[PDB]
């Protein structure tokens, strides 16, 4: 598989905003400003919380299917390729990597394979999408660190995406998890979100490594990025770190990144995040905090890195 010069966009998207001509203009900003050769999609289905089993993918935060396909077909006309990356957010604001039950099935508790039937329904949902679609790759789940230990569950709705779906499938796990994922050998791609802290990438490198050289699958961040934050090139990942802004620590994280993976022939690329549907003003990119790089220093990284790959 060629290197994945990739961008994750959408994830502030609603219904209706893929329809619309400015998701259009920043998806083509983004592959010009970047020179990804690589959207990411990524959606968020809802739940009530980490504990709940009922996973929401019909109400309004959704993009429906006919923008969404809409959307892919205009990626594709634009030389892009397409990852769909279908996920679960809580509505209490819980991040997903928590989404848990009980060991054992307790009369009356939320369980386990209740959860998993709406997750499954869900997921076979968006593979139907990505088969018709010729989307390069599917992305069954991200970060979902205490449900991983439900070998046979995860296994399970693998063989489920297959039936729907004939492209690469790929799991993302989290970070520092790489070596503890069970069921690598059902996916075609093997997957992480890659938030590192700017002083670690050696050890991490050699411990990713050593679990990649074990299959014949190619390997690549499919998240990775850093908010424009004093703090953040230590903890990436954490979006909500309070610190004041700093567009040259973002740029230097990205700067490091590149510098320590590019040597290794395995890192298969990255689906950095993120791009914005609806982008802020790039006159005010220097006072923005977030994920985000147009308008950035880190921008000129990404591009200049991106190109030369
Ligand atoms: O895509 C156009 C149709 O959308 C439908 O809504 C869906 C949506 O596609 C998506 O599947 C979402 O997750 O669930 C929604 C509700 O079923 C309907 O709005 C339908 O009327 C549209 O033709
Ligand atoms: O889930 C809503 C928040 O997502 C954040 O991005 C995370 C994303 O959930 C996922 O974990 C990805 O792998 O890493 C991103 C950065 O940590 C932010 O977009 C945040 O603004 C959202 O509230």
Same mark, same amino acid.
């Given at each position: 598989?060629?290197?994945?010069?990739?961008? @994750?966009?959408?994830?502030?998207?609603?219904?209706?905003?893929?329809?619309?001509?400015?998701?259009?203009?920043?998806?083509?900003?983004?592959?010009?400003?970047?020179?990804?050769?690589?959207?990411?999609?990524?959606?968020?289905?809802?739940? %009530? @919380?980490?504990?709940?089993?009922?996973?929401?993918?019909?109400?309004?935060?959704?993009?429906?299917?006919?923008?969404?396909?809409?959307?892919?077909?205009?990626?594709?006309?634009?030389?892009?390729?397409?990852?769909?990356?279908?996920?679960?957010?809580? $509505?209490?604001?819980?991040?997903?990597?928590?989404?848990?039950?009980?060991?054992?099935?307790?009369? *009356?508790?939320?369980?386990?394979? &209740?959860?998993?039937?709406?997750?499954?329904?869900?997921?076979?949902?968006?593979?139907? !999408?990505?088969?018709? @679609?010729?989307?390069?790759?599917?992305?069954?789940?991200?970060?979902?660190?205490?449900?991983? $230990?439900?070998? %046979?569950?995860?296994?399970?709705?693998?063989?489920?995406?297959?039936?729907?779906?004939?492209?690469?499938?790929?799991?993302?796990?989290?970070?520092?998890?790489?070596?503890?994922?069970?069921?690598?050998?059902?996916?075609?791609?093997?997957?992480?979100?890659?938030?590192?802290?700017?002083?670690?990438?050696? $050890?991490?490198?050699?411990?990713? &490594?050593?679990?990649?050289?074990?299959?014949?699958?190619?390997?690549?961040?499919?998240?990775?990025?850093?908010?424009?934050?004093?703090?953040?090139?230590?903890?990436?990942?954490?979006?909500?770190?309070?610190?004041?802004?700093?567009?040259?620590?973002?740029?230097?994280?990205?700067?490091?990144?590149? &510098?320590?993976?590019?040597?290794?022939?395995?890192? *298969?690329?990255?689906?950095?995040?993120?791009?914005?549907?609806?982008?802020? %003003? &790039?006159?005010?990119?220097?006072?923005?905090?977030?994920?985000?790089?147009? *308008?950035?220093?880190?921008?000129?990284? !990404?591009?200049?890195?991106?190109?030369?790959?």
């Amino acid at each position: 598989m060629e290197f994945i010069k990739g961008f @994750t966009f959408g994830w502030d998207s609603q219904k209706g905003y893929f329809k619309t001509e400015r998701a259009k203009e920043s998806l083509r900003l983004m592959q010009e400003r970047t020179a990804s050769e690589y959207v990411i999609v990524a959606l968020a289905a809802l739940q %009530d @919380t980490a504990h709940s089993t009922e996973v929401d993918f019909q109400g309004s935060h959704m993009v429906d299917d006919d923008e969404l396909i809409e959307l892919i077909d205009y990626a594709k006309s634009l030389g892009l390729k397409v990852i769909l990356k279908p996920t679960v957010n809580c $509505r209490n604001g819980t991040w997903r990597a928590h989404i848990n039950f009980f060991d054992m099935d307790i009369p *009356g508790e939320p369980t386990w394979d &209740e959860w998993f039937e709406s997750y499954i329904n869900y997921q076979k949902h968006y593979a139907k !999408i990505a088969e018709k @679609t010729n989307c390069e790759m599917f992305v069954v789940g991200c970060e979902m660190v205490q449900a991983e $230990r439900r070998e %046979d569950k995860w296994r399970e709705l693998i063989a489920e995406v297959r039936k729907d779906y004939r492209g690469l499938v790929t799991y993302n796990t989290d970070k520092y998890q790489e070596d503890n994922v069970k069921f690598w050998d059902a996916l075609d791609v093997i997957s992480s979100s890659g938030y590192y802290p700017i002083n670690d990438w050696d $050890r991490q490198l050699d411990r990713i &490594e050593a679990v990649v050289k074990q299959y014949d699958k190619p390997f690549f961040f499919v998240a990775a990025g850093c908010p424009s934050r004093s703090g953040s090139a230590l903890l990436p990942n954490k979006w909500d770190l309070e610190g004041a802004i700093n567009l040259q620590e973002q740029a230097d994280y990205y700067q490091v990144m590149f &510098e320590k993976t590019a040597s290794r022939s395995w890192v *298969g690329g990255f689906g950095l995040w993120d791009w914005q549907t609806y982008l802020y %003003d &790039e006159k005010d990119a220097t006072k923005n905090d977030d994920y985000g790089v147009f *308008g950035k220093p880190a921008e000129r990284v !990404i591009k200049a890195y991106y190109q030369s790959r």
